[PDB]
Amino acid sequence: EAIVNAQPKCNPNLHYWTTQDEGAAIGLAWIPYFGPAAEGIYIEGLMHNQDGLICGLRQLANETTQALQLFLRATTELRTFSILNRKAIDFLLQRWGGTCHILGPDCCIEPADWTKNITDK
Amino acid sequence: EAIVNAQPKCNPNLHYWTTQDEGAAIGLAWIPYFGPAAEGIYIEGLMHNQDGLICGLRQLANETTQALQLFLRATTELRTFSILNRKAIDFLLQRWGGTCHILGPDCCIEPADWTKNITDK
Amino acid sequence: EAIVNAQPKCNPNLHYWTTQDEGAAIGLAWIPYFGPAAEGIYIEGLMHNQDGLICGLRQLANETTQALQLFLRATTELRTFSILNRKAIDFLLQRWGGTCHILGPDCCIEPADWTKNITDK
Amino acid sequence: RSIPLGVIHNSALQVSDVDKLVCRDKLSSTNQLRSVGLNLEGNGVATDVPSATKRWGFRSGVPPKVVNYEAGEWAENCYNLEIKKPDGSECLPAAPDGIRGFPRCRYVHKVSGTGPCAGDFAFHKEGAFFLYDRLASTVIYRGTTFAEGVVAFLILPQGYYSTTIRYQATGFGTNETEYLFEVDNLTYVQLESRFTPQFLLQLNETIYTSGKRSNTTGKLIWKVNPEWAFWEXXXXX
Amino acid sequence: RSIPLGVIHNSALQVSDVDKLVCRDKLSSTNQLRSVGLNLEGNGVATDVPSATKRWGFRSGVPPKVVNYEAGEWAENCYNLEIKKPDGSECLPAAPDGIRGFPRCRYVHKVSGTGPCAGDFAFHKEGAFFLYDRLASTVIYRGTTFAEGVVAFLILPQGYYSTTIRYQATGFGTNETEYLFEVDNLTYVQLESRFTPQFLLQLNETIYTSGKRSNTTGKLIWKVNPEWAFWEXXXXX
Amino acid sequence: RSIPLGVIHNSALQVSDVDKLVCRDKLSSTNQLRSVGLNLEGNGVATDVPSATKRWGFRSGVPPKVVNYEAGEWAENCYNLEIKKPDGSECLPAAPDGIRGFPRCRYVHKVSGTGPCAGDFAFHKEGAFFLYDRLASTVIYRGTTFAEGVVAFLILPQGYYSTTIRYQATGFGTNETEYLFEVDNLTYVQLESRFTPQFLLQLNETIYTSGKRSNTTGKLIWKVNPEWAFWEXXXXX
Ligand SMILES: *[C@@H]1O[C@H](CO)[C@@H](O[C@@H]2O[C@H](CO)[C@@H](O[C@@H]3O[C@H](CO[C@H]4O[C@H](CO)[C@@H](O)[C@H](O)[C@@H]4O)[C@@H](O)[C@H](O)[C@@H]3O)[C@H](O)[C@H]2NC(C)=O)[C@H](O)[C@H]1NC(C)=O
Ligand SMILES: *[C@@H]1O[C@H](CO)[C@@H](O[C@@H]2O[C@H](CO)[C@@H](O[C@@H]3O[C@H](CO[C@H]4O[C@H](CO)[C@@H](O)[C@H](O)[C@@H]4O)[C@@H](O)[C@H](O)[C@@H]3O)[C@H](O)[C@H]2NC(C)=O)[C@H](O)[C@H]1NC(C)=O
Ligand SMILES: *[C@@H]1O[C@H](CO)[C@@H](O[C@@H]2O[C@H](CO)[C@@H](O[C@@H]3O[C@H](CO[C@H]4O[C@H](CO)[C@@H](O)[C@H](O)[C@@H]4O)[C@@H](O)[C@H](O)[C@@H]3O)[C@H](O)[C@H]2NC(C)=O)[C@H](O)[C@H]1NC(C)=O
Ligand SMILES: CCOC[C@]12C[C@@H]3C[C@](C(=O)N[C@H]4CC[C@H](N)CC4)(C1)C[C@@](c1ccccc1)(C3)C2
Ligand SMILES: CCOC[C@]12C[C@@H]3C[C@](C(=O)N[C@H]4CC[C@H](N)CC4)(C1)C[C@@](c1ccccc1)(C3)C2
Ligand SMILES: CCOC[C@]12C[C@@H]3C[C@](C(=O)N[C@H]4CC[C@H](N)CC4)(C1)C[C@@](c1ccccc1)(C3)C2
Ligand SMILES: *[C@@H]1O[C@H](CO)[C@@H](O)[C@H](O)[C@H]1NC(C)=O
Ligand SMILES: *[C@@H]1O[C@H](CO)[C@@H](O)[C@H](O)[C@H]1NC(C)=O
Ligand SMILES: *[C@@H]1O[C@H](CO)[C@@H](O)[C@H](O)[C@H]1NC(C)=O
Ligand SMILES: *[C@@H]1O[C@H](CO)[C@@H](O)[C@H](O)[C@H]1NC(C)=O
Ligand SMILES: *[C@@H]1O[C@H](CO)[C@@H](O)[C@H](O)[C@H]1NC(C)=O
Ligand SMILES: *[C@@H]1O[C@H](CO)[C@@H](O)[C@H](O)[C@H]1NC(C)=O
Ligand SMILES: *[C@@H]1O[C@H](CO)[C@@H](O)[C@H](O)[C@H]1NC(C)=O
Ligand SMILES: *[C@@H]1O[C@H](CO)[C@@H](O)[C@H](O)[C@H]1NC(C)=O
Ligand SMILES: *[C@@H]1O[C@H](CO)[C@@H](O)[C@H](O)[C@H]1NC(C)=O
Ligand SMILES: *[C@@H]1O[C@H](CO)[C@@H](O)[C@H](O)[C@H]1NC(C)=O
Ligand SMILES: *[C@@H]1O[C@H](CO)[C@@H](O)[C@H](O)[C@H]1NC(C)=O
Ligand SMILES: *[C@@H]1O[C@H](CO)[C@@H](O)[C@H](O)[C@H]1NC(C)=O
């Protein structure tokens, strides 16, 4: 389904913070003893509303809340870190969790080059 | 291997409780502040011994105990939630963790429709 | 890239300890109440520097430290157990996370037997 | 070998062979995998308090371990222990954060009293688990309702009433354990194995209505004259 | 249904349909998946302390839950609560190990004072989350800076200044809550909803420079005569 | 870049190139992946207590982090610290639940005493880890035996004796640290870097058998006159 922002207002600019795991460290700053404190591990960025993605994101997080709350009610885990990994697993199982029937709608195998390699013979 | 129930008795009816993550919530009950307490998050059901599955399940959990205990001895994790996800990963690796040789016994690719599409030409 | 040991010395013998999840238990020792204490759950082994693997391993763990520390700075998880599982997922996604173009460089499908089965017809 | 996984083939449940690969087996999402917990009750084990407690024991040197499970069975009998040493120190640890009691119990057998407790944790002598609210533990937590059970893992094919029964116990966890069933804080009945939960409730109601409760300040203890699975001093005769 | 996942198709964001399969969708590593958190601020909600606190409430029987998120938005308004009951017992729990405050706040509204706190935890009445440092919680922790927000999950396509504003509060979490803005430990201003953060700082600086702070040992309280989104006793007139 | 993964190609160990894909590489189960921990000992680092402690330092503002590892190396030298400030407050935190000591140590160097401890946690100044029982930490826990080491991740191809050595320390974690080797509670030897573990045990046995222990109520301290890897007051001369 498409994303319909239905909020009273939308800040179209997204001034964000995050971290990076593959930080190109300079010298010895990767060593915890010498590295930055907890407050200085962040990078920043600014993203505008091209393709209306910012307003879409705000609407997307709003609509995620119900499903996400019901998931957290049903888990016994105090802190959940596994959602994204589980979605990568479900991505693979949706495609490769059964026999892949070539040229079927639920099998992502392109046989074109092998079909053309057969035509040359 | 097949499941041989070898318990002194078997309750053939399974009156069970569980939760649901995709609960079709009515109104505002998905909000934690308004939702059910810890005691009321459960659904119930009743399953009979068709195909002898109930007695089989009791035997299955009995036979799982040894392997499961030895797994918990060897882990440092205080509470384990990752077993099922790891089994989904092992399911995929058993099938797609190497080169898939079409028409081999360890490759789940059905080339029939592409073989018939080649016959029409 | 290849592993270049650049340490002042290298112990070429690796006297190691670990656990086993599939321990062939004798009698009732898998039961926690009767099983070994925390100090006796370990197996031991000795591995020599054939193919220079031991010296290579020491160098490998040294070079892993920077990337691993930067990963732990960026996580909020107090104890991380998910690295290896996430690498198995990334292994599958690198190969099966898109459409598999047969006979392409990023598609691990061997069509030889199906190509020969087509030649016999 | 590894942890068995249950699957349905040929109208029967079986363990999946890891060494062999079945391409007809289809796993389309992680929702098709479930962990379930089944109650020892369902295998015919004696559930009276004297019999059940003889299956638990104290042990040191073994760290506790917890595994989660997603679905469980309604239990007829659960247990809840408050055991101290004779010096008044607690024998069982406080329930860790997030471990609540087993959610469906017809009868909760709450046992208080004393014992030697010659070990840091109480384990199941037969290797079974203590089942809590969607968490299975190898050890007993203090004052937390549990059912005895075991866990299974599966590939799926593609009102509530609870009644507490209170007991007092001396010498908990030994060869010579004494159990009393509590009517009020001063009236007790000498417990025996043959006394089912239903029979104890009737004994409690008849003692209350016939006036056989203690009408002094001291402790009154009755003994009862001698006069199948659940799903299928003084005297009194 | 299940937790929605955002993806970019046709120069627009959409929710991925689980029931349908798109082979043109490519996921090459777990690095392509991200969890993000967005601030209620960005949807136009009133952020003044009287309005924001009316969205939180105390509730028992519901265990708290935490989910992580990898990236967040710079907030204009965050909050930090130190609420006790009239008897002096704490209303909010200590921050668990590893939960630090929201990392980017222009104004931290620190609120101290009392209220009935008729519940074990404080939840968001509208279902939103309290955003901490890369952890989102369903409940408020004591003295820990948070922003109100909601979480999204995504498939990616293949200086800093902070200023604390202190308030005193009586009857926290009720229909009739009183708020005072703190100038010093003895000079307060009757808070109203219309007072933006910038206006309170100017009011503080003008009180300090005009000598309208209390020059006694007792409490001085001012009222201000009556004389758009952020990104777009006595008297005084 | 990302965390390197070791693999065997051409009879040699190498790091797997993420940017390139090798279909001949086969990963059939998660059992083929292992995390291992290797001891700094094995690279030739000085393991005497004066040298080893100079590699650790106190730091605030950095949250501790723990990663698990599945297999380890038998260590010749491990360490175990009980350090207080001069005021008697603890310098190191209690071991968290589930973190036990490193499981195989030939010599455990137990160090007690004082120091300034100008930081919330003790980290490894060279970026290495403190190895415990299958958990690797960035910080030192109190009274818990650890080995210095580093972690590797791998794709696999398809009796025990321990002896404690006790030291007293003043000014722990500084440029001018004093170390004493403990014979009994009243007899000490001025520690130097050159003293190997084997030499200290012989010094202890010779002091006991020659009667050079203190026969008073006061503290006796000896100095020893000046008269390769491990795998390959008064005086005394
Ligand atoms: C999975 O199911 C198995 C079968 O139902 C369970 O096996 C049980 O294992 C325990 C020990 O771990 C046994 O307890 C022992 O019993 C013997 C003898 O029992 C007494 O009764 C017999 C008649 O049944 C009598 O002939 C004897 O003289 C005994 O007086 C004792 O000597 C031992 O000390 C010990 O207590 C159970 O008997 C056994 N059950 C059965 C039906 O064989 C197994 O425990 C289950 N696993 C889990 C994790 O629950
Ligand atoms: C996702 O976005 C949704 C839309 O922005 C959010 O919906 C909000 O939901 C809450 C309840 O959960 C509503 O609060 C209620 O408001 C009504 C009426 O509001 C008053 O104002 C209107 C004019 O707007 C006026 O006509 C009325 O007379 C009211 O005085 C109250 O009666 C209720 O008691 C309750 O407070 C919000 O109004 C509503 N917002 C909008 C714009 O509709 C939703 O909360 C978001 N989800 C998350 C998780 O943040
Ligand atoms: C991975 O392996 C690397 C190589 O084995 C390790 O490199 C070590 O890195 C630390 C700093 O992080 C170095 O310590 C520094 O040493 C210099 C100079 O050392 C003194 O000795 C030299 C002779 O060796 C002498 O010429 C000098 O005058 C010095 O007196 C000091 O100035 C610094 O302050 C600092 O202490 C190690 O020297 C270095 N080892 C080697 C062999 O180069 C690296 O630490 C390993 N990573 C992990 C995580 O263990
Ligand atoms: C023989 C195969 O039985 C499967 C099962 C059949 C039913 C339902 C079942 C189950 O958990 N259903 C979920 C409902 C909510 C949905 N969101 C996801 C699926 C699954 C649990 C079960 C069971 C419960 C307790 C012990 C042993 C077993 C009784 C076993
Ligand atoms: C419309 C799709 O937006 C994607 C994104 C685009 C940017 C960057 C983005 C991001 O986390 N970048 C990472 C940087 C470090 C790298 N190591 C890994 C990728 C991703 C976060 C985001 C965002 C932030 C906060 C709230 C909502 C959104 C703003 C959303
Ligand atoms: C060069 C590749 O070495 C692989 C390895 C070869 C051996 C055994 C090995 C291992 O953990 N074996 C497991 C036994 C129990 C089974 N259930 C699963 C496999 C694996 C650990 C190792 C090692 C230990 C310590 C530090 C570095 C290394 C020494 C490295
Ligand atoms: C105590 O328990 C042991 C173990 O079974 C038993 O041999 C002994 O007879 C018991 N003693 C009494 C007095 O019951
Ligand atoms: C019985 O004793 C318990 C605990 O000792 C106490 O809480 C309860 O109030 C008592 N009941 C009566 C009727 O005194
Ligand atoms: C025993 O009987 C009395 C009287 O009806 C009742 O109040 C009490 O709850 C009963 N006890 C139990 C355990 O049912
Ligand atoms: C007093 O106690 C005795 C002994 O329990 C009992 O027989 C008698 O009926 C009681 N009288 C009452 C409850 O009035
Ligand atoms: C208290 O709150 C309730 C709930 O909205 C409201 O009906 C009532 O008027 C309030 N009382 C006062 C004095 O504000
Ligand atoms: C104001 O009060 C706070 C806490 O009550 C105290 O920490 C602070 O020092 C006080 N400030 C002055 C100037 O007295
Ligand atoms: C109020 O003004 C004084 C004087 O400049 C300043 O020291 C104080 O920090 C101000 N308070 C706030 C909250 O800005
Ligand atoms: C003393 O306090 C009064 C009332 O706040 C104020 O009008 C006056 O200016 C103050 N005098 C000073 C600060 O010298
Ligand atoms: C103290 O340590 C510093 C840092 O290396 C050094 O420069 C200084 O000489 C030391 N002082 C003494 C007295 O050892
Ligand atoms: C030496 O001191 C330690 C702790 O100060 C104490 O536990 C031990 O018993 C003492 N040994 C003797 C022989 O007094
Ligand atoms: C020192 O020697 C005595 C005498 O043999 C012995 O009891 C003691 O344990 C020794 N200390 C160490 C650290 O070996
Ligand atoms: C008494 O102590 C002195 C000094 O340590 C030593 O030389 C002498 O042998 C001791 N006498 C004994 C142990 O009998």
Q: For C13-38, give the DSSP string.
A: -EEEEE--TT----TTTTSTTTS--G
The packing angle between helices B83-96 and A83-96, to 10°, is: 40
Question: What does the alpha-carbon distance between residue A75 and residue D135 come to, in Å, rounded to a whole number?
Answer: 10
Q: Specify whether E141 is located in the same domain as E218.
A: no
* Residue D160 counted as domain residue: no
Backbone dihedral region for residue B51 (phi beyond 0: left; psi -120 to 50: alpha; all else: beta): left
Please say whether the beta carbons of E167 and E153 come within 8 A.
no
Question: What does the alpha-carbon distance between residue D135 and residue D70 come to, in Å, rounded to a whole number?
Answer: 8
Please say whether the beta carbons of C104 and A114 come within 8 A.
no
Under an 8 A CB cutoff, do A68 and E66 touch?
no
Report in angstroms the alpha-carbon separations of E38 from A10, A17, C11, E138, E147: 11, 11, 52, 15, 9
Please say whether the beta carbons of E145 and E139 come within 8 A.
no
Q: Which atom of ligand 7 is nearest to the CA of D176?
A: 14
Q: Specify whether E21 is located in the same domain as E122.
A: yes
- Residue recorded with tokens 């599982």: C85
- Residue recorded with tokens 């930090």: E80
Under an 8 A CB cutoff, do B77 and F134 touch?
no
Report in angstroms the alpha-carbon separations of C10 from C65, E216, F14: 18, 75, 17
DSSP string, E64-103: --EEE-SEEE-EEEEEEEEEE-TTS-BSSPPPPTT-PPPS
Radius of gyration for the alpha carbons in chain D, expressed in angstroms and rounded: 21
Report in angstroms the alpha-carbon separations of C20 from D150, F73, F165: 22, 16, 32
Q: Order of strands across the sheet with E178-184?
A: E75-84, E105-114, E163-170, E178-184, E187-190, E220-222
The packing angle between helices C83-96 and A83-96, to 10°, is: 40
Taking the CB of residue E12, how many other CB atoms lie within 10 A of it? 13
- Which residues, other chains included, contact D179 with Cβ-Cβ below 8 Å and sequence gap of 6+? D49, D50, D111, D167, D168, D169, D190, D191
Three-state DSSP state, E198: helix
Exposure string of C91-110, with b = 16+ CB inside 10 Å and e = fewer, is: bbbbbbbbbbbbbeeebbbb
Report the structure determination method: X-ray
Please say whether the beta carbons of E183 and E208 come within 8 A.
yes
- Residue recorded with tokens 């042990």: D59
CA E18 to chain centre: 34
Please say whether the beta carbons of F43 and C62 come within 8 A.
yes
* Residue E235 counted as domain residue: no
Q: Specify whether E101 is located in the same domain as E196.
A: no
Burial class (CB in 10 A: 0-12, 13-18, 19+), E21: middle
Question: What does the alpha-carbon distance between residue D115 and residue D172 come to, in Å, rounded to a whole number?
Answer: 4
E strands within D85-133?
105-114, 121-124, 129-131
DSSP string, F45-69: ---SHHHHHTTEEEESS----EEE-
Three-state DSSP state, B94: helix
Backbone dihedral region for residue F149 (phi beyond 0: left; psi -120 to 50: alpha; all else: beta): beta
Three-state DSSP state, B95: helix
Of the candidates F11, F23, F30, the beta carbon closest to that of C108 is on: F23
Q: Specify whether C113 is located in the same domain as C68.
A: no
Q: Specify whether D73 is located in the same domain as D189.
A: no
Please say whether the beta carbons of C88 and F33 come within 8 A.
yes
Interface probe with B: pick from C96, C114, C120, most Cβ of B within 10 Å: C114
CB pairs under 8 A between A and E: 152
- Does ligand 5 lie within 6 Å of residue A96's CB atom? no
Of the candidates A71, A99, A104, the beta carbon closest to that of B21 is on: A71
Question: What tokens appear for A30 in the block?
Answer: 């990767």
Question: What does the alpha-carbon distance between residue F152 and residue B58 come to, in Å, rounded to a whole number?
Answer: 41
Q: Specify whether A75 is located in the same domain as A85.
A: no
Enumerate the β-bridge partners of residue E73. Answer: A16
Of the candidates D4, D17, D152, the beta carbon closest to that of B57 is on: D152
Which residues span the domain enclosing C116? 81-121
Using a CB-CB distance cutoff of 8 angstroms, which residues of chain A are in contact with residue C83? none
Q: Which of F161, F125, F164, F132 is nearest to F146 (CA)?
A: F132
* F2 → chain A, closest CA residue: A22
Under an 8 A CB cutoff, do B97 and F26 touch?
yes
Exposure string of B32-50, with b = 16+ CB inside 10 Å and e = fewer, is: bbbbeeeeebbeeeeeeee
Query: Beta strand pairing status for F220-222 and F187-190?
Result: parallel
* Residue E166 counted as domain residue: no
Q: Which of C98, B41, C3, F163 is nearest to D160 (CA)?
A: B41
Burial class (CB in 10 A: 0-12, 13-18, 19+), D38: buried
DSSP string, C77-106: -SEE--HHHHHHHHHHHHHHSS-EETTSTT
DSSP string, chain A: -B----SS-----EEEEE--TT----TTTTSTTTS--GGG--EEEEE--GGGHHHHHHHHHHHHHHHHHHHHHH---SEE--HHHHHHHHHHHHHHSS-EETTSTT--EE-HHHHHHHHH-
Enumerate the β-bridge partners of residue D148. Answer: D130
* Residue E125 counted as domain residue: yes
Q: Which of D101, D49, D94 is nearest to D72 (CA)?
A: D101
- Does ligand 9 lie within 6 Å of residue D90's CB atom? no
Q: Specify whether A31 is located in the same domain as A68.
A: yes
- Probe target for ligand 3 pocket from C62, C63, C72, with the most ligand atoms within 8 Å of CB: C62
Question: What does the alpha-carbon distance between residue E196 and residue E49 come to, in Å, rounded to a whole number?
Answer: 10
Interface probe with A: pick from E5, E18, E65, most Cβ of A within 10 Å: E65
The torsion defined by the Cα of D30, D33, D36 and D42, in degrees rounded to 10, comes to 160
Q: Specify whether D15 is located in the same domain as D130.
A: yes
* Residue E168 counted as domain residue: no
Question: What tokens appear for F160 in the block?
Answer: 């025990």
Question: What does the alpha-carbon distance between residue A23 and residue A10 come to, in Å, rounded to a whole number?
Answer: 32
Question: What tokens appear for F113 in the block?
Answer: 């005493």
Taking the CB of residue F87, how many other CB atoms lie within 10 A of it? 6
Q: Which of F166, F183, F169 is nearest to F221 (CA)?
A: F183
Q: Specify whether B31 is located in the same domain as B68.
A: yes
Please say whether the beta carbons of B1 and D1 come within 8 A.
no
Q: Specify whether E122 is located in the same domain as E202.
A: no
Q: Which of D202, D198, D203 is nearest to D230 (CA)?
A: D198
Please say whether the beta carbons of C43 and F105 come within 8 A.
no
Which residues span the domain enclosing E148? 6-155
Query: Any alpha helices (H) in F24-111, and if so which ranges?
Result: 49-53
The torsion defined by the Cα of C49, F6, A30 and A42, in degrees rounded to 10, comes to -170
Report in angstroms the alpha-carbon separations of D82 from D56, D92, D112, D142, F229: 14, 8, 5, 6, 56
Question: What does the alpha-carbon distance between residue D229 and residue E68 come to, in Å, rounded to a whole number?
Answer: 47
Name the neighbours of A, counting chains with at least 3 Cβ pairs within 8 A.
Answer: B, C, D, E, F
Q: Specify whether F50 is located in the same domain as F135.
A: yes
- Which residues, other chains included, contact D98 with Cβ-Cβ below 8 Å and sequence gap of 6+? A76, A77, A78, D135, E63
Question: What does the alpha-carbon distance between residue E76 and residue E40 come to, in Å, rounded to a whole number?
Answer: 11
Question: What does the alpha-carbon distance between residue D190 and residue D232 come to, in Å, rounded to a whole number?
Answer: 27
Under an 8 A CB cutoff, do E149 and A17 touch?
no
Which residue type, as a one-letter code, is found at position F65? Answer: K
Question: What does the alpha-carbon distance between residue D48 and residue D230 come to, in Å, rounded to a whole number?
Answer: 11
Sign of CA dihedral B72, B73, B74, B78: positive
For residue D102, the number of C-alpha atoms closer than 13 Å in the C-beta half-sphere is 32
H or E element that contains C59: helix C53-74
* Domains held by chain B: number: 2
- Does ligand 17 lie within 6 Å of residue F70's CB atom? no
Three-state DSSP state, F190: strand
Question: What does the alpha-carbon distance between residue D183 and residue D202 come to, in Å, rounded to a whole number?
Answer: 11
Q: Specify whether A41 is located in the same domain as A25.
A: yes
Q: Specify whether F20 is located in the same domain as F132.
A: yes
Under an 8 A CB cutoff, do C74 and A41 touch?
yes
Q: Specify whether C7 is located in the same domain as C56.
A: yes
Question: What does the alpha-carbon distance between residue B42 and residue D8 come to, in Å, rounded to a whole number?
Answer: 26
Kindly state the DSSP code that residue E106 receives in the 8-state scheme: E
Question: What does the alpha-carbon distance between residue D176 and residue D179 come to, in Å, rounded to a whole number?
Answer: 10
Which residue type, as a one-letter code, is found at position C85? Answer: N
* Residue D95 counted as domain residue: yes
Query: Beta strand pairing status for E66-68 and A109-110?
Result: unpaired
Kindly state the DSSP code that residue B87 receives in the 8-state scheme: H
* Residue E79 counted as domain residue: yes
CA of D185 to the centre of ligand 8 (A): 6
Question: What tokens appear for C20 in the block?
Answer: 């086993």
Please say whether the beta carbons of D75 and D52 come within 8 A.
no
Q: Specify whether E100 is located in the same domain as E16.
A: yes
Question: What does the alpha-carbon distance between residue C10 and residue A68 come to, in Å, rounded to a whole number?
Answer: 51
Q: Which of D177, D193, D173, D108 is nearest to D147 (CA)?
A: D108
Phi then psi dihedrals of residue A117, to 5 deg: -65, -25
Question: What does the alpha-carbon distance between residue E15 and residue E11 come to, in Å, rounded to a whole number?
Answer: 13
Radius of gyration for the alpha carbons in chain C, expressed in angstroms and rounded: 22
* Domains held by chain D: number: 2
Question: What does the alpha-carbon distance between residue F74 and residue E153 come to, in Å, rounded to a whole number?
Answer: 44
Query: Any alpha helices (H) in E38-191, and if so which ranges?
Result: 49-53
The closest residue, in CA terms, to atom 4 on ligand 18 is F212
- Does ligand 4 lie within 6 Å of residue B20's CB atom? yes
CA of E32 to the centre of ligand 5 (A): 10
Which residue type, as a one-letter code, is found at position E48? Answer: D
Question: What does the alpha-carbon distance between residue B60 and residue F55 come to, in Å, rounded to a whole number?
Answer: 53
- Residue recorded with tokens 């860790």: D96
Q: Specify whether C64 is located in the same domain as C10.
A: yes
Using a CB-CB distance cutoff of 8 angstroms, which residues of chain E are in contact with residue A84? 30, 33-35, 153
E strands within F12-127?
12-15, 33-39, 56-59, 66-68, 71-73, 75-84, 105-114, 121-124
Question: What tokens appear for F124 in the block?
Answer: 């490894």
Q: Order of strands across the sheet with F187-190?
A: F75-84, F105-114, F163-170, F178-184, F187-190, F220-222
Exposure string of B79-106, with b = 16+ CB inside 10 Å and e = fewer, is: bbbbbbbbbbbbbbbbbbbbbbbbbeee
H or E element that contains D102: none
Residues in B whose CB is inside 8 Å of some CB of E read 21-22, 28, 30-35, 37-39
Which residue type, as a one-letter code, is found at position F28? Answer: S
Burial class (CB in 10 A: 0-12, 13-18, 19+), E78: buried
Q: Which of E197, E86, E97, E201 is nearest to E144 (CA)?
A: E97
The packing angle between helices C112-120 and B112-120, to 10°, is: 40
Q: Specify whether C91 is located in the same domain as C35.
A: no
Question: Which residues precede chain breaks (C–N over 2.5 Å) in chain F?
Answer: 158, 227, 232
Backbone dihedral region for residue E202 (phi beyond 0: left; psi -120 to 50: alpha; all else: beta): alpha
Question: What tokens appear for F236 in the block?
Answer: 């005394």
Kindly state the DSSP code that residue F146 receives in the 8-state scheme: B
E strands within E1-157?
6-9, 12-15, 33-39, 56-59, 66-68, 71-73, 75-84, 105-114, 121-124, 129-131, 135-137, 147-155
Taking the CB of residue E140, how many other CB atoms lie within 10 A of it? 22
Report in angstroms the alpha-carbon separations of F134 from B19, C100, F69, F185: 34, 39, 5, 34
Q: Specify whether A17 is located in the same domain as A67.
A: yes
Q: Specify whether B57 is located in the same domain as B113.
A: no
Residues in A whose CB is inside 8 Å of some CB of B read 66-67, 69-71, 73-74, 76-77, 82, 85-86, 89, 92-93, 96-104, 109, 111, 115, 118
Q: Specify whether D191 is located in the same domain as D123.
A: no
Q: Which of F179, F9, F62, F55 is nearest to F110 (CA)?
A: F179
Interface probe with B: pick from E2, E54, E56, E59, most Cβ of B within 10 Å: E59
Q: Specify whether C51 is located in the same domain as C89.
A: no
The closest residue, in CA terms, to atom 7 on ligand 5 is A47
Taking the CB of residue F57, how many other CB atoms lie within 10 A of it? 16
Enumerate the β-bridge partners of residue D7. Answer: D14
Which residue type, as a one-letter code, is found at position D61? Answer: G
Q: Specify whether E40 is located in the same domain as E106.
A: yes
- Does ligand 17 lie within 6 Å of residue F208's CB atom? yes
Query: Any alpha helices (H) in chain E, and if so which ranges?
Result: 49-53, 197-210
Burial class (CB in 10 A: 0-12, 13-18, 19+), D186: middle
Backbone dihedral region for residue F211 (phi beyond 0: left; psi -120 to 50: alpha; all else: beta): left
* Residue E163 counted as domain residue: no
Backbone dihedral region for residue E211 (phi beyond 0: left; psi -120 to 50: alpha; all else: beta): left
Using a CB-CB distance cutoff of 8 angstroms, which residues of chain C are in contact with residue A111? 102
Q: Specify whether A69 is located in the same domain as A100.
A: no
Burial class (CB in 10 A: 0-12, 13-18, 19+), D23: middle
Nearest Cα of chain B lies from the Cα of A69 at a distance, in angstroms, of 7
F177 alpha carbon, closest ligand: 15
Interface probe with C: pick from A33, A101, A110, most Cβ of C within 10 Å: A110
Q: Which of E196, E198, E163, E201 is nearest to E182 (CA)?
A: E201
Q: Specify whether E61 is located in the same domain as E121.
A: yes
3-state secondary structure A42-67: CEEEEECCHHHHHHHHHHHHHHHHHH
Of the candidates B21, B25, B110, the beta carbon closest to that of A101 is on: B110
Query: Beta strand pairing status for E105-114 and E75-84?
Result: parallel
Nearest Cα of chain D lies from the Cα of A87 at a distance, in angstroms, of 9
- Residue recorded with tokens 């105390």: E58
Number of residues assigned to chain D: 237
